Every structure is written in C-alpha cells, then in structure tokens.
Design a protein around this ligand. Sequence first.
Ligand SMILES: CCCCCC/C=C/CCCCCCCC(=O)O
Ligand SMILES: CCCCCC/C=C/CCCCCCCC(=O)O
Ligand SMILES: [Cl-]
Ligand SMILES: [Cl-]
Ligand SMILES: [Cl-]
Ligand SMILES: [Zn+2]
Ligand SMILES: [Zn+2]
Ligand SMILES: [Zn+2]
Ligand SMILES: [Zn+2]
Ligand SMILES: [Zn+2]
Lengths: 266, 266
Amino acid sequence: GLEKTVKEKLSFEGVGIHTGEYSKLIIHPEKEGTGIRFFKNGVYIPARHEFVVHTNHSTDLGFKGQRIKTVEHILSVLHLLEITNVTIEVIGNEIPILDGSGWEFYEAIRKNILNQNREIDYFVVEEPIIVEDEGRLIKAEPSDTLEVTYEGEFKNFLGRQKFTFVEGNEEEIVLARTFAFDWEIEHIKKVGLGKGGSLKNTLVLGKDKVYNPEGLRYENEPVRHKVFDLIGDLYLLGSPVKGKFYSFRGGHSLNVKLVKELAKKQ
Amino acid sequence: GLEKTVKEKLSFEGVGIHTGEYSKLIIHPEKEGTGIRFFKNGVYIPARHEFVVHTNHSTDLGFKGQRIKTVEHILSVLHLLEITNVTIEVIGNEIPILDGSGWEFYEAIRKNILNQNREIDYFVVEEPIIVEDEGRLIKAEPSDTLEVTYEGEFKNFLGRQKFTFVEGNEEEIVLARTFAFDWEIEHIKKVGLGKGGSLKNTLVLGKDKVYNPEGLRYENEPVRHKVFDLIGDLYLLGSPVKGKFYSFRGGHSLNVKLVKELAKKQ
Ligand SMILES: CCCCCC/C=C/CCCCCCCC(=O)O
Ligand SMILES: CCCCCC/C=C/CCCCCCCC(=O)O
Ligand SMILES: [Cl-]
Ligand SMILES: [Cl-]
Ligand SMILES: [Cl-]
Ligand SMILES: [Zn+2]
Ligand SMILES: [Zn+2]
Ligand SMILES: [Zn+2]
Ligand SMILES: [Zn+2]
Ligand SMILES: [Zn+2]
C-alpha cells in the first residue's frame, strides 16, 4: 500500500459525548512520512501510544498541557482507509461524537483519498503475544492482513457473542454505534463524563431491553463497535497494522496495554 | 381574591419533552372575566376540561383541529399564583418543558402580577366525592383553602410516601421536577413520545438508583411533583379551586376524570 492523505481539508463538528461541549475537526493534508497527528492550541499531539493520558470510557491523548478526548473513532476510520499523513486540527477538548459510529467520518474521508509517493511501512506483529487483566484478554499473532475478532460476555440479553473483521469488510463495522448499559450511566455522569450522551449518539441497553426507539442496526452491533474501537486503538502503534487479533471482553485500557507491549517488544 | 393577569407579555421557549420540537410561549394580559385560554394558529383553546384530548404521559388540549401538549405545568403555576385572565400564545405543538418543574414559570409570573377589578369566582367543592380506577384513587371534599395531598406507592426504592400542599407553601412544589422510571422509557419512546426527554429535564429513577448526577432535590421530589401536576389538572375546572384533595397513586387520567365529575355535579 501507498501512504495516503486527503485531497483537501475535511471538517466535522458537533458535541463531545463526554464533555458535552461543541467542538470541530479539520483534517489537513500532509506530505509523505508525516504521520497522523492532532493539533490543538498550537501543540502537535502525535496519534501514538506515548501520548495516551486516559483510557476509561475513551482513549485520550495529551501533550505539553494540551489534551484531546475520544480519538478512537476517527483514528479507527483513518486506520481502515489507510490514511497515513494528516493533521487533525481540533477546536475543542474532544473529538465530535456525531452519531456514535464512524459512518460520517468514513464516507467523507473515503472519497477524498490521495495516494502519495511511498510504500506504507506497516507495523507487523512478528510473534504471538497475550495480555490479560481481570478475566479480560487480548491475543495477537502474525498475519499478512488485519484481522480483528471481539468476543463479548454480557450480563444482559446480548449474552455471549463474537464478531470478526477482515480487510474488505470495513462497512460492516463503520456503522456500529457506541453503546452503554443503563447500569453504567450513573457512574459515567458522577465522574464528570458522558455529558454529551443521548439516545441520538448512544445505544442504551437495559438488562433485556433496548431503550433506543430505533433498536439495534445488527443483533450484534455492540461487539462490532468493540472491533471498531480496538482497530482505532491499534493505530496508536504509529502506522497501519498487519496482524491477527482476538479480544475477549477487551476495552481501551487493555487495548492500550497491548499496544504498548507490542511497541516495546519491537 | 381579586382576578389577576400580567403587567406585560412574558415569553418562554425551549423544547417540548414529548415532541422534541422547539416551541415558544407568550402570556398576554387580558381583561376581567376573560379566563385562561391558549392561542394557536388562530384558534383559542380554553384551559377547560371539555377540551382535553389526551391524558397519557401528559394533559393535552385541542379544539377545531389545533392541539397543544403538556399544559399541566404552566396551568399549575397559573393556578398557584391565581392568575385568572391571560392568553397563552403557543408557537409549536407543546408547552416548553424547560427544567421539568414550574420554577422558571413561577418566578417570572410572580413578579408581573396585576390585580384587577373583580372578586374571583372560585370553584368550590360542595360535597365529598371519590373516583377510583385500577387501585388508583382520588378523593375530594369541602375546604376554605386549596389543600392537596399525594400518596405514592412506588415499586422502586422511593417505596411508600406522601406529601401535602397547603396555600402558602407554593415554593415547596414549584421546584419539584418531572420524573420517570427507567422501566417506562422504552414504552414512552415506542409510542412516539418523550422525544425531548433528557436528564436535564427529567429525573430518571432506577429500581434503587437515581441516574441524574444532581440527585433528588428532596427525598420525596416525585410525590411533590405529583401534587404539582394535580394542581395544574384541577385548574381545568375553569377557575381557582377551593377544596381538600387526597390522591393515592393518581395520574392525569384520574385527575381529569375527577375534574369532569366535579364539574358535572355542579
Ligand atoms: C440525557 C439522556 C440519556 C443517555 C445518556 C447516555 C450515557 C452516556 C454514555 C457514554 C458512552 C461512553 C462510551 C463511549 C466510548 C467509545 O465508544 O469508544
Ligand atoms: C436511560 C436514559 C434516558 C432519559 C430519557 C428521558 C425520557 C423522558 C420521558 C418522558 C417523561 C414523561 C412524563 C412527563 C409528564 C409530567 O411531568 O406531567
Ligand atoms: Cl470506570
Ligand atoms: Cl457530535
Ligand atoms: Cl415545566
Ligand atoms: Zn469510570
Ligand atoms: Zn467506541
Ligand atoms: Zn404575542
Ligand atoms: Zn403509554
Ligand atoms: Zn408534571
């Protein structure tokens, strides 16, 4: 694959699911070898694991006193389309959540791709690895293609189920929205988070009922979104990834723990 | 008491808890003997029981093809302050829910009262009456003052409790917000309602947890709000009421059923 960027600036705006504040993005084109980086109040924050400053309920980055919340969805989309050189200008403290999935981001970036002059230097998983924690587990092994599987064991009706993404099936996960169980909402709100949450950007799941009037887009939309998240967190490795991943009940924290292991080893 | 109206137009705007649409109110002053009436698309809708067209999840009025949803909170405030002559102009299909209580309405109307030249012709409960339905019950008897008691028997932690409003204690109920149990939200949304609902205008109560980060304003804020509602529904009798009411698990439907009984009898 050839490094890619955008043919022109693309902007998005809306509220942040956590801050509740309005915010706007502006993806700028960049030359070969630049990499993915955010820009806020004059500071460049590389979309790399060394800048992760928070992983509960979202993956946040920060540098030199400047922070940006929830970068997983836009990074996931960038990872899927293989965009490698862009500066994500952020006016606000968080990435707009939009509808909760990566659809809008995907559709716009997909038709504004600009191939550049250089082969992509993929981060390739060279040997097997496993990272565990409180029953949660993520496994990674060598592969010529990006393959991600997420298995969930839910306390509500979703019960136990898994989903697998393989290159070419981008559209099966870019629509999967963000979700939360009703029993977690009180916590999110108490710790100063989820201020921008609503049924318009979050699928609220009860012990055996879906609150959202629109129901689920897929009987397993939740685990599909989990794959979407993992794929975004993986891009923090610094470049498009080539490996086979299996995540059992993983989350941003474990995802990042894995990312750091991989980087460290190589 | 002397009939009252406002010293000048007072307007309020916001979203409707049910429609989700924006809407604005404009309370206009009116001469003696006018009464409380709404105005929409050229049609005057008297704030009277004969115009009630819906009572599930809200008290709605309608006439000659024009409808206005959720009139209980503004009417309650009008009933408490004893405003008797005004035209509530409605731009939209529902009364703005605002924060879910009658605070904003109360504060504005309270300092713009204009006493007029005529004694109020109070609707006076002349004999005892009881209206029942599926265990729910409302009782009314003679009284020189408006006295309203609401007793609830909740399936969640609130358990069993009651509250009593007596003239002079207006402020103890004008702040009590709208509430709903998480287990009802799916229904509201399915029947095309609660489209404007959020934790910003509704207290969502779980089986033993309060979702709202701000918690309850009173350990019994729910039953206080029920009294607030009943007082608004009673004003549909056509004029300030003087009677002693006791409501056991009552709701808009029973409230109106009572209102109609009373009117019919007298
Ligand atoms: C005001 C009414 C209601 C609905 C409130 C929804 C609660 C907010 C939940 C926050 C979701 C956090 C998970 C998002 C992270 C991700 O998708 O990677
Ligand atoms: C779990 C997340 C969600 C919050 C969504 C809030 C839904 C609002 C429900 C509609 C309330 C109806 C009762 C209002 C009538 C009244 O107070 O008289
Ligand atoms: Cl947490
Ligand atoms: Cl948004
Ligand atoms: Cl209100
Ligand atoms: Zn937390
Ligand atoms: Zn997500
Ligand atoms: Zn007007
Ligand atoms: Zn109903
Ligand atoms: Zn109410």
